[PDB]
Protein backbone atom coordinates (compact mmCIF):
# COMPACT_ATOMS: atom_id res chain seq x y z
CA UNK A 1 0.00 0.00 0.00
CA UNK A 2 1.36 3.35 -0.95
CA UNK A 3 2.17 5.68 1.65
CA UNK A 4 1.21 9.69 1.35
CA UNK A 5 2.70 12.15 3.62
CA UNK A 6 0.83 15.49 4.54
CA UNK A 7 2.95 18.43 5.59
CA UNK A 8 0.06 19.17 7.68
CA UNK A 9 -3.48 18.13 9.04
CA UNK A 10 -5.26 20.50 6.52
CA UNK A 11 -3.48 18.72 3.39
CA UNK A 12 -3.81 15.32 5.27
CA UNK A 13 -7.87 15.70 5.51
CA UNK A 14 -8.05 16.93 2.24
CA UNK A 15 -6.53 14.39 1.15
CA UNK A 16 -7.91 11.27 3.20
CA UNK A 17 -11.08 12.22 1.52
CA UNK A 18 -9.70 11.62 -1.78
CA UNK A 19 -8.10 8.36 -1.41
CA UNK A 20 -10.51 6.90 0.93
CA UNK A 21 -8.07 4.30 2.64
CA UNK A 22 -6.64 3.46 -1.35
CA UNK A 23 -3.38 5.05 0.46
CA UNK A 24 -1.85 5.17 4.27
CA UNK A 25 -2.25 9.22 4.51
CA UNK A 26 0.31 10.76 6.96
CA UNK A 27 0.74 13.78 8.65
CA UNK A 28 3.65 15.70 9.39
CA UNK A 29 2.52 18.82 11.33
CA UNK A 30 -0.43 17.49 13.65
CA UNK A 31 -3.38 19.40 14.20
CA UNK A 32 -2.39 21.36 17.35
CA UNK A 33 1.09 21.41 16.08
CA UNK A 34 2.38 24.94 14.79
CA UNK A 35 2.67 24.74 10.85
CA UNK A 36 4.71 27.92 10.70
CA UNK A 37 7.44 26.76 13.10
CA UNK A 38 7.80 22.86 13.45
CA UNK A 39 10.36 20.74 14.92
CA UNK A 40 11.31 17.80 12.90
CA UNK A 41 11.56 14.81 15.21
CA UNK A 42 13.07 11.57 14.40
CA UNK A 43 9.79 9.55 14.16
CA UNK A 44 9.26 12.25 11.70
CA UNK A 45 12.07 10.71 9.86
CA UNK A 46 10.57 7.66 9.43
CA UNK A 47 7.06 9.40 8.16
CA UNK A 48 9.40 11.08 5.90
CA UNK A 49 11.74 8.01 4.57
CA UNK A 50 8.33 5.39 4.45
CA UNK A 51 6.28 8.60 2.13
CA UNK A 52 5.93 7.73 -1.36
CA UNK A 53 4.51 10.93 -2.34
CA UNK A 54 5.14 14.22 -0.50
CA UNK A 55 2.20 16.76 -0.41
CA UNK A 56 2.99 20.51 0.81
CA UNK A 57 1.24 23.86 0.75
CA UNK A 58 4.19 25.99 -0.83
CA UNK A 59 3.36 29.77 -0.76
CA UNK A 60 6.55 29.26 2.35
CA UNK A 61 4.65 27.67 4.30
CA UNK A 62 6.93 24.97 5.43
CA UNK A 63 10.38 27.27 4.67
CA UNK A 64 11.71 26.13 7.76
CA UNK A 65 11.32 22.47 7.64
CA UNK A 66 11.50 21.88 4.33
CA UNK A 67 15.30 20.90 4.40
CA UNK A 68 13.72 17.42 6.17
CA UNK A 69 12.64 16.17 2.84
CA UNK A 70 15.96 14.73 1.64
CA UNK A 71 17.50 11.67 1.30
CA UNK A 72 14.18 10.75 0.29
CA UNK A 73 12.95 7.22 -1.03
CA UNK A 74 14.01 6.86 -4.56
CA UNK A 75 10.96 8.51 -6.91
CA UNK A 76 9.21 10.71 -4.29
CA UNK A 77 8.28 13.81 -5.33
CA UNK A 78 7.25 16.57 -3.37
CA UNK A 79 4.11 18.25 -4.41
CA UNK A 80 2.83 21.53 -3.68
CA UNK A 81 -0.88 21.68 -3.54
CA UNK A 82 -1.49 25.40 -4.72
CA UNK A 83 -0.25 24.95 -7.59
CA UNK A 84 -2.35 27.59 -10.15
CA UNK A 85 -3.00 29.88 -7.22
CA UNK A 86 -1.65 33.46 -7.81
CA UNK A 87 -0.08 34.47 -4.37
CA UNK A 88 -1.15 37.13 -2.30
CA UNK A 89 2.07 39.39 -0.52
CA UNK A 90 2.81 39.60 2.82
CA UNK A 91 3.38 43.57 2.25
CA UNK A 92 1.87 46.47 1.03
CA UNK A 93 2.79 46.70 -2.55
CA UNK A 94 7.63 42.11 -4.30
CA UNK A 95 7.17 40.06 -1.08
CA UNK A 96 7.01 37.12 0.50
CA UNK A 97 3.96 35.25 -0.40
CA UNK A 98 1.33 34.64 2.47
CA UNK A 99 0.25 30.83 2.53
CA UNK A 100 -3.44 31.05 4.02
CA UNK A 101 -4.57 29.61 0.50
CA UNK A 102 -6.80 27.03 1.94
CA UNK A 103 -9.38 29.93 3.48
CA UNK A 104 -10.81 30.28 0.11
CA UNK A 105 -13.73 27.97 -1.35
CA UNK A 106 -12.35 28.25 -4.83
CA UNK A 107 -9.03 27.30 -3.66
CA UNK A 108 -10.40 24.47 -2.23
CA UNK A 109 -11.29 23.00 -5.16
CA UNK A 110 -7.88 23.83 -6.28
CA UNK A 111 -6.33 21.80 -3.25
CA UNK A 112 -8.72 19.08 -4.28
CA UNK A 113 -7.23 19.23 -8.10
CA UNK A 114 -3.86 18.92 -7.42
CA UNK A 115 -4.39 16.52 -4.93
CA UNK A 116 -6.51 14.30 -6.82
CA UNK A 117 -3.85 14.56 -9.87
CA UNK A 118 -1.05 13.93 -7.36
CA UNK A 119 -2.53 10.69 -6.35
CA UNK A 120 -3.61 9.46 -10.35
CA UNK A 121 -0.15 9.96 -11.15
CA UNK A 122 0.96 8.03 -7.68
CA UNK A 123 -1.34 5.29 -7.65
CA UNK A 124 -3.05 5.28 -11.56
CA UNK A 125 -5.09 1.97 -11.47
CA UNK A 126 -6.97 3.70 -9.12
CA UNK A 127 -8.09 6.69 -10.81
CA UNK A 128 -11.72 6.22 -11.49
CA UNK A 129 -11.98 6.17 -7.98
CA UNK A 130 -9.88 9.32 -7.29
CA UNK A 131 -11.44 10.79 -9.95
CA UNK A 132 -15.29 10.16 -7.94
CA UNK A 133 -13.73 10.99 -4.62
CA UNK A 134 -12.65 14.27 -5.82
CA UNK A 135 -15.62 15.07 -7.02
CA UNK A 136 -18.09 13.87 -4.41
CA UNK A 137 -15.48 15.76 -1.59
CA UNK A 138 -15.60 18.98 -3.95
CA UNK A 139 -19.65 18.81 -3.94
CA UNK A 140 -19.64 18.42 -0.14
CA UNK A 141 -17.37 21.81 0.43
CA UNK A 142 -19.91 23.71 -1.73
CA UNK A 143 -22.72 22.80 -0.66
CA UNK A 144 -21.80 23.47 3.19
CA UNK A 145 -19.87 26.63 2.20
CA UNK A 146 -21.74 28.59 -0.81
CA UNK A 147 -24.96 29.23 1.57
CA UNK A 148 -22.30 31.00 4.32
CA UNK A 149 -20.82 32.74 0.92
CA UNK A 150 -24.27 33.62 -0.37
CA UNK A 151 -25.28 35.01 3.31
CA UNK A 152 -21.91 37.07 3.27
CA UNK A 153 -22.40 38.77 -0.19
CA UNK A 154 -25.41 40.44 1.73
CA UNK A 155 -23.28 42.58 2.89
CA UNK A 156 -23.18 46.26 2.40
CA UNK A 157 -20.07 47.35 0.46
CA UNK A 158 -18.70 49.90 3.01
CA UNK A 159 -19.29 46.56 5.61
CA UNK A 160 -16.83 44.71 3.43
CA UNK A 161 -13.92 44.46 6.03
CA UNK A 162 -12.41 41.17 7.57
CA UNK A 163 -10.12 42.39 10.43
CA UNK A 164 -8.35 39.44 11.95
CA UNK A 165 -4.86 38.83 14.04
CA UNK A 166 -2.92 37.15 11.64
CA UNK A 167 -3.10 38.18 8.02
CA UNK A 168 -4.96 34.89 7.21
CA UNK A 169 -8.15 35.77 5.67
CA UNK A 170 -5.86 37.28 2.69
CA UNK A 171 -7.23 34.42 0.12
CA UNK A 172 -11.24 34.08 1.70
CA UNK A 173 -11.35 38.21 1.09
CA UNK A 174 -10.00 37.92 -2.90
CA UNK A 175 -12.10 35.35 -3.14
CA UNK A 176 -15.19 36.67 -1.85
CA UNK A 177 -14.91 40.23 -2.94
CA UNK A 178 -14.12 41.85 0.87
CA UNK A 179 -11.03 43.53 1.99
CA UNK A 180 -8.78 42.28 4.79
CA UNK A 181 -7.01 44.11 7.76
CA UNK A 182 -4.54 42.51 10.26
CA UNK A 183 -1.99 43.03 12.80
CA UNK A 184 1.14 40.83 11.72
CA UNK A 185 0.96 38.64 8.15
CA UNK A 186 2.19 35.49 9.89
CA UNK A 187 2.50 33.76 13.76
CA UNK A 188 5.68 33.79 14.48
CA UNK A 189 4.09 40.79 15.32
CA UNK A 190 5.19 44.67 15.18
CA UNK A 191 3.92 48.58 16.53
CA UNK A 192 3.29 50.38 13.58
CA UNK A 193 1.19 47.61 11.94
CA UNK A 194 -0.87 48.04 15.24
CA UNK A 195 -1.49 51.39 14.88
CA UNK A 196 -2.31 51.11 11.14
CA UNK A 197 -5.25 49.02 11.54
CA UNK A 198 -6.39 50.93 14.64
CA UNK A 199 -6.93 53.95 12.41
CA UNK A 200 -8.15 51.60 9.42
CA UNK A 201 -10.52 50.57 11.83
CA UNK A 202 -11.64 54.14 13.20
CA UNK A 203 -11.60 55.54 9.57
CA UNK A 204 -13.91 52.68 8.42
CA UNK A 205 -15.88 52.16 11.56
CA UNK A 206 -15.06 48.63 11.73
CA UNK A 207 -17.11 46.96 14.16
CA UNK A 208 -15.12 43.44 14.77
CA UNK A 209 -11.81 42.00 15.05
CA UNK A 210 -11.08 38.37 15.88
CA UNK A 211 -8.25 36.40 17.18
CA UNK A 212 -7.18 32.99 16.14
CA UNK A 213 -6.92 29.43 17.71
CA UNK A 214 -2.95 29.41 17.55
CA UNK A 215 -2.71 32.50 18.53
CA UNK A 216 -3.13 35.49 21.76
CA UNK A 217 -6.48 37.23 21.83
CA UNK A 218 -4.99 40.12 23.21
CA UNK A 219 -3.90 42.29 20.87
CA UNK A 220 -7.41 41.88 19.32
CA UNK A 221 -8.69 42.75 22.28
CA UNK A 222 -6.72 45.81 22.90
CA UNK A 223 -7.16 46.97 19.48
CA UNK A 224 -10.89 46.28 19.79
CA UNK A 225 -10.55 48.47 23.21
CA UNK A 226 -8.67 51.72 21.50
CA UNK A 227 -10.98 51.54 18.26
CA UNK A 228 -14.65 51.46 20.04
CA UNK A 229 -14.94 47.72 17.93
CA UNK A 230 -15.72 44.44 19.70
CA UNK A 231 -13.54 41.26 19.91
CA UNK A 232 -15.09 38.93 17.56
CA UNK A 233 -13.88 35.68 19.09
CA UNK A 234 -11.71 32.95 17.98
CA UNK A 235 -11.21 31.73 14.16
CA UNK A 236 -9.76 28.21 13.14
CA UNK A 237 -7.17 28.87 10.34
CA UNK A 238 -4.10 27.24 11.21
CA UNK A 239 -4.72 23.65 11.99
CA UNK A 240 -7.73 21.52 12.46
CA UNK A 241 -8.55 21.32 16.01
CA UNK A 242 -8.50 18.37 18.16
CA UNK A 243 -11.07 15.97 17.29
CA UNK A 244 -13.70 15.90 20.20
CA UNK A 245 -13.36 20.70 18.69
CA UNK A 246 -15.15 23.03 16.15
CA UNK A 247 -12.68 22.06 13.82
CA UNK A 248 -11.69 18.38 13.50
CA UNK A 249 -11.97 18.14 9.59
CA UNK A 250 -10.85 20.87 6.57
CA UNK A 251 -15.04 21.03 5.73
CA UNK A 252 -15.60 21.99 9.09
CA UNK A 253 -12.57 24.44 9.78
CA UNK A 254 -13.94 26.45 6.96
CA UNK A 255 -17.72 25.98 7.90
CA UNK A 256 -17.05 26.93 11.53
CA UNK A 257 -14.82 30.18 10.73
CA UNK A 258 -16.71 31.28 8.05
CA UNK A 259 -20.30 31.22 9.87
CA UNK A 260 -18.40 32.76 12.93
CA UNK A 261 -17.90 35.35 10.86
CA UNK A 262 -21.11 35.67 8.91
CA UNK A 263 -22.63 35.87 12.40
CA UNK A 264 -20.32 39.10 12.89
CA UNK A 265 -21.41 41.04 9.74
CA UNK A 266 -25.02 40.96 10.37
MN1 LIG B 1 -1.14 31.15 10.01
Redesign the pocket.
Given at each position: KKVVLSSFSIIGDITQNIAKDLVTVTTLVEAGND??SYQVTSADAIKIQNADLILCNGLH?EETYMKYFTNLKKGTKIITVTDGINPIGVSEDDSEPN??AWMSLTNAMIYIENIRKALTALDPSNAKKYELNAREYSEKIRNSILPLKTRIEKVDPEKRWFVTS???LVYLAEDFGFKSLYLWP??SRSPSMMRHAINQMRSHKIKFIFS?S??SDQPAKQVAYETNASYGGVLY??SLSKPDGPAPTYLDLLRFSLTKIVDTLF
Open positions: SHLPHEGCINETNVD
